[PDB]
């Protein structure tokens with residue numbers, strides 16, 4: 615078929631599975647969330663918590679699906695249909711190494727639901743406690759062993775792919791042990807080889823030798839807020855792509871529709887990026903495509919705390935908060951606008 619509606623398997627959408635309901639999970643997990651103290655606000659702050667009631671959730675927006683559970687198979691079905699609408703072929707699943715049966719259940723449910731719609735799943739390896747290259751290797755082995763034969767497990771030219779968030783928290787000399795073909799605990803040329811995509815944050819003078827010396831296969835930028843880092847400044851993407859191509863690296867810039875996290879970080883208003891009825895998303899996605907990249911990542915499907923989600927949101931005013939909403943656009947606008955950009959990306963590929 616050549617309908618201009620098929621999934622794109624070089625488009626990765628960051629997905630969060632940490633939402634809970636009292637009924638399914640015992641608590642409205644993540645809809646309830648601690649409010650962060652101001653890191654520049656001095657001592658004795660008592661910022662409190664967002665309780666995750668119907669009226670007061672830990673987002674500046676409000677989900678069309680309500681305070682859902684990430685463990686609810688019926689929600690997962692709906693999410694996969696939303697991925698199909700968006701044409702996003704890869705779900706990049708947050709992974710916190712919780713070592714708990716409820717995590718294991720969720721991951722299996724997500725893989726199963728994804729496969730019904732021919733969506734693929736890869737893992738976004740988060741900065742879990744004491745993360746280091748040895749336990750990373752062990753966890754990569756575990757994930758490939760447990761899930762590598764699942765039909766929804768993502769591969770690119772035969773290799774799994776992992777995104778590594780805050781990869782700068784680990785020195786290049788440690789990464790080399792895992793990721794150089796000669797490394798002490800290498801995955802290269804083993805059953806557990808994978809494309810390892812590190813987080814490019816700051817200036818080229820720092821990031822270029824970091825990526826080379828660490829032996830990452832590529833890099834991504836994550837942040838949905840333009841200008842938050844050098845890497846999330848889209849005017850740098852042409853030059854970042856040129857460097858990537860020269861050095862055999864895969865650049866996967868991250869694009870998002872906006873940013874606002876002031877319910878959970880009230881002091882963080884300088885990072886707000888307004889959606890402007892889709893014009894912000896359009897500008898960022900256009901820059902990624904114009905840079906000539908081979909793959910794009912989307913921040914985010916459903917990071918509701920940070921206001922970067924493309925998942926449908928609805929107008930809502932409760933007695934506790936007046937939420938933002940998609941304004942003049944309909945609740946599914948960011949899904950269908952993603953599909954528009956996926957088509958432009960494919961036309962360019």
Ligand SMILES: OC[C@H]1OCC[C@@H](O[C@H]2O[C@H](CO)[C@@H](O)[C@H](O)[C@@H]2O)[C@@H]1O
Pocket residue numbers: 628708738740741779917919920
């Ligand atoms: O997936 C990479 C990162 O994406 C942004 C969120 C971040 O998690 C931190 O922030 C959220 C709030 O937005 C907290 O709920 C988490 O516990 C964590 O501090 C991801 O690491």
